[PDB]
Design a protein around this motif. Structure first.
Motif, mmCIF file in Angstrom:
data_model
loop_
_atom_site.group_PDB
_atom_site.id
_atom_site.type_symbol
_atom_site.label_atom_id
_atom_site.label_comp_id
_atom_site.label_asym_id
_atom_site.label_seq_id
_atom_site.Cartn_x
_atom_site.Cartn_y
_atom_site.Cartn_z
ATOM 1 N N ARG A 29 0.756 -1.195 0.056
ATOM 2 C CA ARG A 29 -0.125 0.047 0.027
ATOM 3 C C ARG A 29 0.715 1.238 -0.017
ATOM 4 O O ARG A 29 1.252 1.681 -1.160
ATOM 5 N N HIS A 30 0.897 1.900 1.242
ATOM 6 C CA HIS A 30 1.693 3.097 1.225
ATOM 7 C C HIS A 30 3.007 3.346 0.766
ATOM 8 O O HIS A 30 3.761 4.379 0.945
ATOM 9 N N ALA A 31 3.475 2.120 0.213
ATOM 10 C CA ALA A 31 4.761 2.299 -0.208
ATOM 11 C C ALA A 31 5.095 3.035 -1.626
ATOM 12 O O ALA A 31 5.901 3.454 -1.659
ATOM 13 N N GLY A 32 3.981 2.882 -2.313
ATOM 14 C CA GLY A 32 3.860 3.625 -3.668
ATOM 15 C C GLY A 32 4.223 2.857 -4.653
ATOM 16 O O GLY A 32 4.152 3.110 -6.117
ATOM 17 N N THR B 17 -1.865 8.394 -6.528
ATOM 18 C CA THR B 17 -1.449 7.302 -5.869
ATOM 19 C C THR B 17 -2.127 6.057 -5.545
ATOM 20 O O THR B 17 -3.530 6.315 -5.229
ATOM 21 N N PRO B 18 -1.731 5.001 -5.351
ATOM 22 C CA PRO B 18 -2.599 3.798 -5.514
ATOM 23 C C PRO B 18 -2.917 3.166 -3.927
ATOM 24 O O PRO B 18 -3.432 2.332 -3.912
ATOM 25 N N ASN B 19 -2.205 3.720 -3.086
ATOM 26 C CA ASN B 19 -2.104 3.337 -1.524
ATOM 27 C C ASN B 19 -3.349 4.077 -0.827
ATOM 28 O O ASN B 19 -3.737 3.385 -0.004
ATOM 29 N N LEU B 20 -3.872 5.158 -1.384
ATOM 30 C CA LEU B 20 -5.329 5.682 -0.881
ATOM 31 C C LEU B 20 -6.445 4.904 -1.118
ATOM 32 O O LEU B 20 -6.927 4.342 -2.321
#
Lengths: 105, 48
Positions: A29-32, B17-20
């Motif tokens: 996830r938040h890794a990008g 961004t794909p993390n959201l």
């Protein structure tokens, strides 16, 4: 520049992060960068599977806490990622070196 | 972590961004449009 600067962020995440374990979904996830944003890196720059590299990092981090003369041995593996004592007791397969004797050193 | 930092950043670089899980555009529009803030206004002093 590999996958738009993921190497400069993985080290920071490993440093800043807590004892939370690192898996595909956790770091995906938040890794990008998704699964393939990390597979190419682990294949080229490291050439080693995640379960072994994370364990080696945890052992290298705990090598100093064992020398810091701490009496709560059960919490040493917990504060660094090992959720159970038996799993950390990894140390037998890596060092074949006693938990206590090393702790004594 | 600030509202002044959220209102100033352009969504063209914010929504990629794909993390959201979700940007919560409902609450975003509720905090910008209902308070008289359009897309990208420079405030006087946002940070405390």
């Amino acid at each position: 520049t590999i996958s738009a600067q993921v190497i400069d962020t993985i080290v920071e995440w490993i440093d800043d992060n807590l004892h939370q374990p690192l898996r595909i979904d956790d770091i995906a996830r938040h890794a990008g960068y998704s699964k393939w944003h990390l597979q190419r890196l682990f294949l080229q720059y490291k050439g080693e599977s995640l379960g072994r590299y994370i364990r080696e990092r945890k052992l290298l981090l705990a090598a100093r806490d064992l020398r810091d003369t701490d009496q709560r041995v059960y919490d040493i593996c917990l504060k660094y990622g090992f959720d159970s004592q038996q799993t950390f007791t990894v140390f037998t397969r890596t060092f074949n070196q006693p938990p206590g004797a090393y702790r004594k050193e | 972590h600030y509202i002044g930092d959220l209102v100033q950043r352009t969504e063209v670089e914010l929504l990629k961004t794909p993390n959201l899980g979700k940007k919560s555009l409902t609450e975003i529009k509720d905090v910008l449009a209902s308070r008289g803030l359009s897309l990208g206004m420079r405030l006087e002093n946002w940070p405390p």
